[PDB]
Design a binder for this molecule. Structure first.
Ligand SMILES: Nc1ncnc2c1ncn2[C@@H]1O[C@H](COP(=O)(O)OP(=O)(O)O)[C@@H](O)[C@H]1O
Lengths: 96, 109, 96, 444, 80, 97, 85, 109, 96
DNA sequence: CCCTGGAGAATCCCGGTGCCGAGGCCGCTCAATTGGTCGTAGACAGCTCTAGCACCGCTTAAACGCACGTACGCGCTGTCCCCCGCGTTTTAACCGCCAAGGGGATTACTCCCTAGTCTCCAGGCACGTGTCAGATATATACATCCTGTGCA
DNA sequence: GCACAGGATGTATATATCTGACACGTGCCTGGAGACTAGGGAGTAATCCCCTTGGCGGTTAAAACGCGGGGGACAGCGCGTACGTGCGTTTAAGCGGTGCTAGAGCTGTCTACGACCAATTGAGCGGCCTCGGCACCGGGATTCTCCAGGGC
């Protein structure tokens, strides 16, 4: 067989079934969502890398991710994303 | 012996692959080291944004009396929200069309 | 016989094409134009169908946005017809 | 065996003996080829001694060469009048005015160069440095030498950039903070020996090193008047709102950048902040007094003073505190006067003259501590109230002796209001350390 | 070959303009629009061909087109 | 009777003068006050390096100059000589702000 | 008990200053409503830039805003500034 | 017997610091490995661009009748040149000013 | 003693003395030149990094640098700089 | 000068089709677990320079308020011309189908190029220091603008 | 109603002083060059098969073209308003100071805790194959619009 390909399709489908239990998605819409997720990941990761370089630090951390989120997303989305990420990190720290 | 493997995504109560995100951060040449919390934070942010956009797109799809999300629904959801229009201002969606908007001077009088 | 005023058919077409979501240029002429433009940089260039489709999508999106800016400039000039001067002003303000 | 009598070239009476001894001191100081500080403070005037030195040079020596005197704009006219009255032979020229007047003056008098003494101000010197630098200078006089106490300042650099063969500094308070400014002054006087910035090992060496190029007298040779001062420090506790804001700021919307500066006025009055005021009606009644311990004590003290000799003076270092005190005084039906930085010269002088009338109905006079012009003859007053103390004990003493002018013939009493267990105590301790340094170095 | 720029016909330009939201179109708009399309396409295709030549390939991919658009600030979601 | 220039020559002379010079055309202390006032909302107890405010003033003046150029182009497009808020709004709308 | 406000800070961007900026832009005649609009535009621009700068400063664990932070903010906005570092 | 330490800038005939460029590439997190000829190529490109800008700025300095280059001369050189204007289209040069340009309609007639 | 800062000022001065012998430069102009060189280096290096990631390699080469130059620089500058870089690499390889 | 009345366009409820998304299986590779180490960043301590807050002083340039005249923005009108709506003929897009082969994607192999380490040494940087390039001022010399006047 | 003189204004040009930054010299130290070794990434050859290109024929929608007409573009005219220009006045900017104290950068140490690397491994995820529901296409009946003509 040919080379396997990686995509966020399974997790996008899971979150879709979670938010709207009785709604499907098309292949083109899934490709759009996959490109969207890759692009957002690229933006956040690049901004965090630049932050670490600016502050003369050699590691990317939760502080860098949070600061990149506040720099890139506008306003209310930034607030919600910060709260959700902090919730996830607190739960991961408490459960490990 | 070793305990049954517990996914870090399940530990954080997420649904996006934190392990895959950590690998992508390590292979992406962003920095030399990656902390433990950065993959979890990034996966949560990605999941939140995906949930927001998919919720708006699903509402738009139900407004058109369909059950499948299509690029038209995605474009409607993105362009009819200020925050998402700012985030995706310079993005083109394949077969998304345009928002219906006619300047009022052109309307018959 | 029956006949329409000069401008109602245009408004109906505006609604139709702002409600539709497909492409609006002919695929074979666009493909031939793309190959002709690519003639100047290399010989015996081959293309994927997806490449031509993506080029057509981007070209149409750019042209639609340009026409929206042109219409805004024309309305600013207290006109309903759009003109080459309107297109040139839009390009100049954009930075092209 | 020196200039023991009043000169023959000085007019309008003879110089007094305690002045003519300083005159012979200056005369011998030139022949000895060293430059020193005249620190006799307010006697009968260092202006007459300096004019006598210049006149002695020009008459007895054949050196009428270019001389410059650097005085503040407030004393420029007084110096010109003294030149015209006492020793009229010297042809002093005053350079002050806008750009057109400066250019006209230089091209019409300064470049022709018929003058002998040029009296100018600090600002005019900074503006006309380029054309003042050309002339060779035989005598440079800087009245109020404490202006150049700090090195690496524009005036301090420019003044020594000139070509001067003699130097002289006049100051009544040479020492104000520490010995580095004294070293700066001595470096200006003669850079060749004080090149380095650095009671048997000390004290005596300082005295005998400073004696050769410094002199100071005490305003007690004649006396016969000017009763001494009584200094009382009143410790007043913080009020409820003062205490709450004090704790709040100490543990810390309001902007609080400079912590010491924010604790200070807060010890004074919480109304200098935002949100500590009562309701929007802004009713001025008993809110000002009750919320400040100093205000309560002041409301207790003032009626006693007005039942007594009265004519009280108030010194404060914040114009907003002045505003609050003014509002309280106008609410309590006390007629007052205000001297402040923003008060123009005409209103300054008119208020001073009105208060100085022997039969005056005005009771309270409020002055900002440093906003004086180093003159201000408020000799008709009796009580000096120091609402807050400066870091400079010499600034405090100058504000204190502002009421100790020669026209004052009654005992004057000073009240310092201090809040116990605050930063006011640290202010007082620092001022006491600086004052003991001043006394041990100069007076002893 | 040649004479392929004129394959972008007047009706297609009118359809694009109607989707833009205009009602009356001047007669000289068509040549201007063809020139604008030509310059835009030339830039994008130049970048895509550069990417393809670095890849050492004879075939232009949708990936190459997407990368060119992204480096021109005109991101395209829907192809990868 | 007194000599007066016509309405528009002094404007052209000023245009040439300010298109020749390079200094800053906003008062530094008012600009610094404005920057501090704006920053106060985002955070309290902030200190500014003097270079930061200078860079902010440079960027702000460049932005305003470019905006005014595009506004003048729009006004000339409308067959006018005066610039108006509608022209400024059109320029910002085209640029995407 | 004495309070007296002076003026808005944004009124410090004066009418002659805006006129000078317009002259550099190349404008001849100016309408009287331009000044309020320009003050609003400057306010929005500064708010965005200062938000980015203060975000950088807070990440750096500091309370002083630096020229480097301003440069990084402008570079994120897409208005690269040369000469300040 | 160690040969004379001869620098790679002189080896390539450049005037820019090839060694510093190589160190910056290695520390900058662009890829895990760097070729030998890449820093030489990059230094050559940087030198050409600097030389072009400096030549144009010196010509502008001669036009203004001065022997020193200032940011005004740099801005004058960067504008009036199509290639450099495209390259630095969104760059602000501090205390650089604007080109003299008056629209034809505004001129008196 | 103050710390050490790295600047391209020496090499900029060398290029200036080579191309315009009897000329000078001010501190602000030198700072602008430093920022310009840093910006160009950053753009070219980032483009080469993305190229290496796209083609699935872990080595930045002169080929990657040349492709990044052709992608960034506009036309005549691109070709002149490519010729210069080829000459420099030829000199480096041939004799040293 | 708004109120019928027809054409034409769009919308809504039904029915047959197909094809693509959702579901269920198989195999693999990649993440999770456990163990060990190191090196980076958090913490601390000492120094040196900048910034904030409350003032003071002086100087003077710039903002402000005002009055007046004059271009100019804006509305109204007339003309024409050109763009639009519609019908007819022509042309090639499009869809389906087929055939052939270039080249993209993959695998195995081996080399050669780069990372890493050690050692030595000279280029680059901070610090002083003097002198000249340019900013400023003044004083002519010329280019521009505006107005009045004279004339055909 | 047009074209020139001159007067006032502004702007350029030449030259003299002076000062504050730039260009150069010096000491030294830290990063770069010379030499070597090890290992895996990338170049090279060969194979497969898939995706590209060429070609043909039939339908039919879309394009090209022509005609007739009404609406919009544009030039012109007049006016009442709002802005440019110059002037006298006020105000706050600008510069130069005080007095203290914290903040930040740099240097120099220390230590421990978190991140990297390795071997093992089983569970997760990607590819594949199949089938029913959703979307689509086609059709008939119905509402809503727009335009023309007239008695409102
Ligand atoms: N005619 C006079 N000659 C000398 N001294 C006088 C005369 N009249 C008054 N004085 C003294 O001069 C003092 C005031 O002058 P002062 O303020 O010392 O001058 P300055 O300001 O120059 O120091 C008074 O104390 C007074 O005793």
């Amino acid at each position: 067989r040919k080379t396997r390909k990686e995509s966020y399709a399974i997790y996008v489908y899971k979150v879709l079934k979670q938010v709207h239990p009785d709604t499907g998605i098309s292949s083109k819409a899934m490709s759009i969502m996959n490109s969207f997720v890759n692009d957002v990941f690229e933006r956040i990761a690049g901004e965090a890398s630049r932050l670490a370089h600016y502050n003369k630090r050699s590691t990317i951390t939760s502080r860098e991710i949070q600061t990149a989120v506040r720099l890139l997303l506008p306003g209310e989305l930034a607030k919600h994303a910060v709260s959700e990420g902090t919730k996830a990190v607190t739960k991961y720290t408490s459960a490990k | 012996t070793r305990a049954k493997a517990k996914t870090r995504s399940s530990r954080a109560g997420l649904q996006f692959p934190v392990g895959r995100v950590h690998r992508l951060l390590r292979k992406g040449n962003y920095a030399e080291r990656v902390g433990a919390g950065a993959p979890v934070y990034l996966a949560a942010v990605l999941e939140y944004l995906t949930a927001e956009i998919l919720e708006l797109a699903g509402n738009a799809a139900r407004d058109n009396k369909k059950t499948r999300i299509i690029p038209r629904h995605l474009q409607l959801a993105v362009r009819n929200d200020e925050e998402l229009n700012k985030l995706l201002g310079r993005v083109t969606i394949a077969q998304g069309g345009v928002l219906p908007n006619i300047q009022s001077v052109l309307l018959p009088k | 016989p029956h006949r329409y005023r000069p401008g109602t058919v245009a408004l109906r077409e505006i609604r139709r094409y702002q409600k539709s979501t497909e492409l609006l240029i002919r695929k074979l002429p666009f493909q031939r134009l793309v190959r002709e433009i690519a003639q100047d940089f290399k010989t015996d260039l081959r293309f994927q169908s997806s490449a031509v489709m993506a080029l057509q999508e981007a070209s149409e999106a750019y042209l639609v946005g340009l026409f929206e800016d042109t219409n805004l400039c024309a309305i600013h000039a207290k006109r309903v017809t759009i003109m080459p001067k309107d297109i040139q002003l839009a390009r100049r303000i954009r930075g092209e | 065996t020196r200039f023991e009598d009043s000169p023959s070239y000085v007019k309008w009476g003879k110089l007094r003996d305690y002045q003519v001894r300083g005159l012979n001191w200056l005369i011998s100081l030139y022949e000895n080829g060293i430059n020193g500080i005249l620190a006799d403070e307010m006697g009968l005037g260092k202006t007459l001694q300096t004019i006598s030195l210049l006149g002695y040079m020009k008459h007895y020596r054949n050196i009428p060469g270019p001389h410059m005197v650097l005085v503040p704009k407030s004393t420029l006219h007084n110096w010109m009048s003294e030149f015209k009255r006492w020793v009229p032979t010297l042809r002093s020229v005053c350079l002050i005015g806008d750009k057109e007047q400066r250019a006209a003056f230089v091209r019409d008098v300064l470049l022709p160069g018929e003058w002998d003494v040029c009296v100018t101000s600090y600002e005019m010197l900074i503006k006309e440095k380029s054309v003042f630098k050309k002339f060779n200078w035989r005598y440079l006089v800087i009245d109020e030498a404490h202006r150049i106490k700090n090195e690496k300042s524009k005036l301090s650099e420019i003044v020594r950039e000139f070509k001067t063969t003699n130097r002289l500094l006049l100051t009544g308070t040479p020492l104000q903070n520490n010995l580095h400014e004294l070293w700066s002054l001595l470096n200006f006087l003669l850079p060749d020996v004080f090149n380095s910035a650095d009671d048997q090992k000390l004290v005596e060496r300082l005295h005998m090193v400073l004696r050769p190029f410094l002199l100071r007298r005490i305003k007690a040779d004649v006396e016969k008047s000017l009763p001494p001062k009584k200094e009382v420090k009143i410790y007043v506790g913080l009020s409820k709102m003062q205490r709450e804001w004090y704790t709040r700021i100490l543990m810390k919307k309001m902007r609080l950048l400079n912590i010491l500066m924010q604790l200070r006025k807060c010890c004074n009055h919480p109304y200098l902040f935002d949100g500590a005021e009562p309701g929007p009606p802004y009713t001025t009644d008993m809110h000002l007094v009750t919320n400040s311990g100093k205000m309560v004590v002041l409301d207790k003290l003032l009626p006693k003073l007005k039942e007594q000799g009265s004519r009280v003076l108030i010194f404060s270092q914040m114009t907003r505190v002045l505003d609050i005190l003014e509002d309280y005084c106008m609410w309590r039906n006390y007629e007052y006067c205000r001297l402040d930085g923003q008060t123009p010269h005409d209103e300054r002088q008119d208020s001073i003259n009105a208060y100085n009338e022997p039969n005056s109905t005005k009771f309270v006079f409020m002055l900002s501590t440093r906003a004086g012009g180093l003159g201000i003859n408020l000799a008709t007053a009796d009580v000096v109230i120091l609402y807050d103390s400066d870091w400079n004990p010499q600034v405090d003493l100058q504000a204190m002796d502002r009421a100790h002018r020669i026209g004052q013939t009654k005992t004057v009493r000073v009240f310092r209001f201090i809040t116990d267990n605050t930063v006011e105590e640290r202010i007082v301790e620092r001022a006491e350390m600086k004052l003991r340094l001043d006394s041990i170095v100069i007076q002893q | 070959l040649r004479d392929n720029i004129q394959g972008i016909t007047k009706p297609a330009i009118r359809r694009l303009a109607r989707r833009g939201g205009v009602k009356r179109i001047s007669g000289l708009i068509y040549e201007e629009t063809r020139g604008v399309l030509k310059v835009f396409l030339e830039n994008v295709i130049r970048d895509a061909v550069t990417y393809t030549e670095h890849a050492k390939r004879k075939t232009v991919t949708a990936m190459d087109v997407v990368y060119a658009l992204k480096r021109q600030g005109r991101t395209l979601y829907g192809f990868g």
